[PDB]
Design a protein around this ligand. Structure first.
Ligand SMILES: Cc1c(C(=O)O)oc2ccccc12
Ligand SMILES: Cc1c(C(=O)O)oc2ccccc12
Length: 284
């Protein structure tokens, strides 16, 4: 496997930091003027993480259409993803407005609500069946239907009701609960098992709106998830699977959201995940 030989060449040479800085240097720079308007300051978790204007998701409202969220559209793979920050106390209603308006079937969460002793996102879904949540600013109701807790992830069934029309939809919440507070997982086995559970649900399929994927900033862990999924899909579709270039796929994804893959360790982990996942793509 050429990809694995390259991995072995970068590992033996210890050049992960050098490869990663080359990506940072060649990455796209597009305007984010709407993100930086004074009216939007309390809609951004991090001053240095903003959606580009050309790819941002617009809310269907005349007052203020802004959310920190990007559409990643992968033309050859025929997959789309929405990558967004962890919701803030004043954007939980906007978050669920976006899921409703974009016709999404799945939400993929890659962080815990508290990590490193600090809050990384709002508690934006209900924890008990009999205590539903109402978002008065966007006119939505959200109810917990069922919860399935596993060793490495939790899957939840949620009911989202548009209180304006009384239409309801089932949303699937896929919560990866074991990413370590520091660094990356030692093995990609649990992360690949999780990716395959999201796929098997239909949440990534073209009959639905794009999956919504978040972590705290929506660029690091979130970037790893979409990069691994698109690379493995391209390996399945191409006559020459050996031709899939993870660095070129990452730079294509960075045309749509800044900063995807935050560290050289996240870049090495993405290679390991694709290399191990291919071995099943090889029919094994
Ligand atoms: C990358 C790759 C190679 C190779 O590098 O030779 O062979 C494959 C078979 C299936 C899926 C991916 C691959
Ligand atoms: C998803 C769901 C709902 C709902 O969305 O209200 O009600 C159920 C009953 C059994 C199994 C699944 C469901």
């Amino acid at each position: 496997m050429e990809m694995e030989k390259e991995f072995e060449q970068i590992d033996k040479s210890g050049s992960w930091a050098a490869i990663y800085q080359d990506i940072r240097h060649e990455a796209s720079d597009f305007p984010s003027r709407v993100a930086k308007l004074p009216k939007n300051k309390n809609r951004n978790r991090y001053r240095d993480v903003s959606p580009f204007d050309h790819s941002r998701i617009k809310l269907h409202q005349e007052d203020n259409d802004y959310i920190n969220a990007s559409l990643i559209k992968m033309e050859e793979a025929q997959r789309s993803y929405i990558l967004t920050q962890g919701p803030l106390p004043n954007t939980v209603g906007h978050f669920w407005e976006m899921v409703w308006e974009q016709k999404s079937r799945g939400v993929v969460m890659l962080n815990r609500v508290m990590e490193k002793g600090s809050l990384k996102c709002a508690q934006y879904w209900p924890q008990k069946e009999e205590k539903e949540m109402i978002f008065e600013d966007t006119n939505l109701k959200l109810t917990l239907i069922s919860e399935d807790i596993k060793s490495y992830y939790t899957v939840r069934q949620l009911e989202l009701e548009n209180l304006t029309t009384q239409e309801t939809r089932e949303i699937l919440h896929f919560h990866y609960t074991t990413w370590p507070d520091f660094g990356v997982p030692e093995s990609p086995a649990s992360f690949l098992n999780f990716l395959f559970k999201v796929r098997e649900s239909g949440s990534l399929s073209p009959e639905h709106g794009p999956v919504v994927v978040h972590c705290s900033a929506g660029i690091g862990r979130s970037g790893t998830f979409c990069l691994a999924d698109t690379c493995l899909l391209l390996m399945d579709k191409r006559k020459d699977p050996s031709s899939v270039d993870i660095k070129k796929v990452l730079l294509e994804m960075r045309k749509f959201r800044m900063g995807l893959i935050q560290t050289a360790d996240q870049l090495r982990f993405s290679y390991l995940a694709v290399i191990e996942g291919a071995k099943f793509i090889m029919g094994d």
